[PDB]
Design an enzyme around this catalytic site. Sequence first.
Site, PDB file in Angstrom:
ATOM      1  N   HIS A   1     -19.847  14.785 -49.687  1.00  0.00           N
ATOM      2  CA  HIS A   1     -20.539  15.716 -48.794  1.00  0.00           C
ATOM      3  C   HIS A   1     -22.003  15.349 -48.557  1.00  0.00           C
ATOM      4  O   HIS A   1     -22.637  14.675 -49.375  1.00  0.00           O
ATOM      5  CB  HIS A   1     -20.460  17.122 -49.375  1.00  0.00           C
ATOM      6  CG  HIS A   1     -19.137  17.782 -49.164  1.00  0.00           C
ATOM      7  ND1 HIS A   1     -18.618  18.012 -47.913  1.00  0.00           N
ATOM      8  CD2 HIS A   1     -18.225  18.264 -50.038  1.00  0.00           C
ATOM      9  CE1 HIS A   1     -17.445  18.612 -48.023  1.00  0.00           C
ATOM     10  NE2 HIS A   1     -17.183  18.776 -49.304  1.00  0.00           N
TER      11      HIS A   1
ATOM     12  N   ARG B   1     -18.019  19.117 -37.157  1.00  0.00           N
ATOM     13  CA  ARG B   1     -17.806  19.567 -38.535  1.00  0.00           C
ATOM     14  C   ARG B   1     -16.347  19.963 -38.771  1.00  0.00           C
ATOM     15  O   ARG B   1     -15.712  19.509 -39.718  1.00  0.00           O
ATOM     16  CB  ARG B   1     -18.741  20.731 -38.847  1.00  0.00           C
ATOM     17  CG  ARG B   1     -18.403  21.512 -40.112  1.00  0.00           C
ATOM     18  CD  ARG B   1     -19.577  22.408 -40.490  1.00  0.00           C
ATOM     19  NE  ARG B   1     -19.307  23.312 -41.597  1.00  0.00           N
ATOM     20  CZ  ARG B   1     -19.607  23.051 -42.866  1.00  0.00           C
ATOM     21  NH1 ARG B   1     -20.181  21.906 -43.221  1.00  0.00           N
ATOM     22  NH2 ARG B   1     -19.322  23.941 -43.805  1.00  0.00           N
TER      23      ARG B   1
ATOM     24  N   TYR C   1     -15.191  29.665 -53.373  1.00  0.00           N
ATOM     25  CA  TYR C   1     -14.357  29.414 -52.198  1.00  0.00           C
ATOM     26  C   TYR C   1     -13.323  28.352 -52.598  1.00  0.00           C
ATOM     27  O   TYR C   1     -13.576  27.571 -53.519  1.00  0.00           O
ATOM     28  CB  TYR C   1     -15.222  29.028 -50.947  1.00  0.00           C
ATOM     29  CG  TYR C   1     -16.359  28.026 -51.207  1.00  0.00           C
ATOM     30  CD1 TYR C   1     -17.645  28.462 -51.591  1.00  0.00           C
ATOM     31  CD2 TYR C   1     -16.146  26.647 -51.081  1.00  0.00           C
ATOM     32  CE1 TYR C   1     -18.668  27.555 -51.854  1.00  0.00           C
ATOM     33  CE2 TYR C   1     -17.162  25.737 -51.343  1.00  0.00           C
ATOM     34  CZ  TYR C   1     -18.417  26.188 -51.730  1.00  0.00           C
ATOM     35  OH  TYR C   1     -19.418  25.268 -51.989  1.00  0.00           O
TER      36      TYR C   1
ATOM     37  N   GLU D   1     -22.513  15.895 -53.529  1.00  0.00           N
ATOM     38  CA  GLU D   1     -23.340  16.341 -52.406  1.00  0.00           C
ATOM     39  C   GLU D   1     -24.679  15.612 -52.450  1.00  0.00           C
ATOM     40  O   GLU D   1     -25.353  15.619 -53.469  1.00  0.00           O
ATOM     41  CB  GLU D   1     -23.561  17.845 -52.556  1.00  0.00           C
ATOM     42  CG  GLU D   1     -24.437  18.518 -51.529  1.00  0.00           C
ATOM     43  CD  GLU D   1     -23.752  18.630 -50.202  1.00  0.00           C
ATOM     44  OE1 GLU D   1     -23.272  19.743 -49.883  1.00  0.00           O
ATOM     45  OE2 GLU D   1     -23.708  17.601 -49.488  1.00  0.00           O
TER      46      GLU D   1
HETATM   47  C1  LIG Z   1     -23.546  21.671 -46.358  1.00  0.00           C
HETATM   48  P1  LIG Z   1     -21.887  21.215 -46.890  1.00  0.00           P
HETATM   49  O1  LIG Z   1     -20.976  21.180 -45.725  1.00  0.00           O
HETATM   50  O2  LIG Z   1     -22.048  19.776 -47.601  1.00  0.00           O
HETATM   51  N1  LIG Z   1     -21.284  22.506 -47.938  1.00  0.00           N
HETATM   52  C2  LIG Z   1     -19.911  22.713 -48.422  1.00  0.00           C
HETATM   53  C3  LIG Z   1     -20.130  22.943 -49.931  1.00  0.00           C
HETATM   54  C4  LIG Z   1     -19.223  22.148 -50.842  1.00  0.00           C
HETATM   55  O3  LIG Z   1     -19.036  20.946 -50.574  1.00  0.00           O
HETATM   56  O4  LIG Z   1     -18.718  22.725 -51.843  1.00  0.00           O
HETATM   57  C5  LIG Z   1     -19.202  23.881 -47.699  1.00  0.00           C
HETATM   58  O5  LIG Z   1     -19.808  24.483 -46.799  1.00  0.00           O
HETATM   59  O6  LIG Z   1     -18.046  24.314 -47.933  1.00  0.00           O
HETATM   60 ZN   LIG Z   2     -20.023  19.358 -46.362  1.00  0.00          ZN
END
Ligand SMILES: CP(=O)(O)N[C@@H](CC(=O)O)C(=O)O
Ligand SMILES: [Zn+2]
Lengths: 301, 301
Positions: free
Chosen positions: A107, A54, A155, A169
């Site tokens: 994502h 990751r 964030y 996503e």
């Molecule tokens: C479960 P993910 O890694 O697709 N989630 C992102 C969320 C995003 O893409 O905003 C993150 O943890 O920052």
């Molecule tokens: Zn992600």
Amino acid sequence: HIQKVAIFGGTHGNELTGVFLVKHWLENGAEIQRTGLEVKPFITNPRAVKKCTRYIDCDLNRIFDLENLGKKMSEDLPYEVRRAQEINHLFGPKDSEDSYDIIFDLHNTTSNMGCTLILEDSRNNFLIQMFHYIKTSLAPLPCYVYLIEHPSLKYATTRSIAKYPVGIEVGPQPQGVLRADILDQMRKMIKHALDFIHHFNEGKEFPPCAIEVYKIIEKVDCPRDENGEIAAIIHPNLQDQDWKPLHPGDPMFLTLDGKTIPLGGDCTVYPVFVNEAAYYEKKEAFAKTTKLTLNAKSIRC
Amino acid sequence: HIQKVAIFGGTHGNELTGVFLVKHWLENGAEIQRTGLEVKPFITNPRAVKKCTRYIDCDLNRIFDLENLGKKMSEDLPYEVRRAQEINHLFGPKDSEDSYDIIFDLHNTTSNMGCTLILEDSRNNFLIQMFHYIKTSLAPLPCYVYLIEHPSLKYATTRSIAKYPVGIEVGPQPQGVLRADILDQMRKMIKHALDFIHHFNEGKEFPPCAIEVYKIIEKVDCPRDENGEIAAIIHPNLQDQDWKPLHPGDPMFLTLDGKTIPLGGDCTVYPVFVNEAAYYEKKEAFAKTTKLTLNAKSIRC
Ligand SMILES: CP(=O)(O)N[C@@H](CC(=O)O)C(=O)O
Ligand SMILES: [Zn+2]
Ligand SMILES: CP(=O)(O)N[C@@H](CC(=O)O)C(=O)O
Ligand SMILES: [Zn+2]
């Protein structure tokens, strides 16, 4: 009017739908080109991609802010910090007017969220309109809008460089795995997103519109030991029921013995990111949202 | 007559069903105790478990053989080699008569295999009988027997220390994730396995029986680049259809351009471990099997 567009893949190296699409589009961008629109595909974390991990030193998608992006370029810097700068320089600077107009960050999730769009700003009529177009285009295939606007829980994402950041996503997919159906779903999300930008640059007028979004309110950890180890698991009835309404009565967790732990509080919620692999580390079993409707004013030019 | 029984969890540190069950059973083995039967739960790869990773230096479940178990204990040894020895000493030695009688190695897969039992020996009437009992007990819940007996492709598993090695595999589950339904399914597999050992030690007589198994024949990689990068993906029709018959006509892979690649060869096969995360590294898209019926003679104590 919208000229500079990027598609990011591999922000997290073990989410392979984005990595795979981008790698292909770097060798033949035909699918993502539109007349009068120059779109650049890019691999954000090439090293995490190589280790099918990751991240290497820290989550890349949480450090596109002043604290980090202003640091003096060194070699004792976490790889991802060194890299966030390299990316700010190529597609930004963030908060400058030379920034790319639109960035799509691709994502994957192990949660059962289907096609998901992430909105960082509840007042950006341009994005709301984009999202409405995609939603409507995908139908009857569902598509959901996760609104991460919050005074403290927003964030600093890779895509926040752009004037219009877009999170794409798609789940569920196990990490380190490349499913075909999930890939088709992501492609189509992009086709319609680019299609909308073209239509806009061709002067098409869009009336007002409303869309449903799910707004972050609170993130929930699973019950823990006296020693801080996992003590229950996502109840079978909550597992896989991302987006659907969860009332204070209903089951949340399940122990081995196995007593059910129910929701509580005083109002219905809509869970998202239920049993996301990457959030075990972050102590987040799932996220609670309130469903609501947002409006866009018309737009053009 | 059967006295020494172990249950291994955490052979791979990112397969959490086993880790979770074992950690609990170390604090309260009630569920796995049977009168006249002392069964020991154990975490095989405690360090991979701590990093929620699969392994540290190499796959633990491929090195319980002479090449590795005969190496001089050092500290410049891959962790897993150092560890395979420690385990051989505790539950073996392999090939000795002091070895444990039965070891259950718990496992998870991202493939859609449901409840799976892994058989290392096509002639072990005792195992065949165990497996038949579990199968029939679980019904109508499916249960499948994967036979890894092969002149060259049998790998040296953690459980192969025992006189009777047993692989318990349950999917689909993303790595690093704890699903409740998958946990229930594994528990029940164990309940019936221990139940059968008790019945045997109580002198119950078992007539002959037949069971269907799926025998390894060949492992298939996905199509690759000129540079050895992934060039197609598991076709949507093959995805998730572990165990079901795949004829030479039918689709296997899918390229990004929509081109289908079909099976070929001259006979029907039964795919197993379709799109298993952990086998990307091993260049195995899925494994081909022939369906076979095996017979056990009666047995008694
Ligand atoms: C479960 P993910 O890694 O697709 N989630 C992102 C969320 C995003 O893409 O905003 C993150 O943890 O920052
Ligand atoms: Zn992600
Ligand atoms: C998908 P897995 O890593 O649980 N499969 C085992 C199969 C087994 O238990 O024999 C292995 O790779 O060694
Ligand atoms: Zn395993």
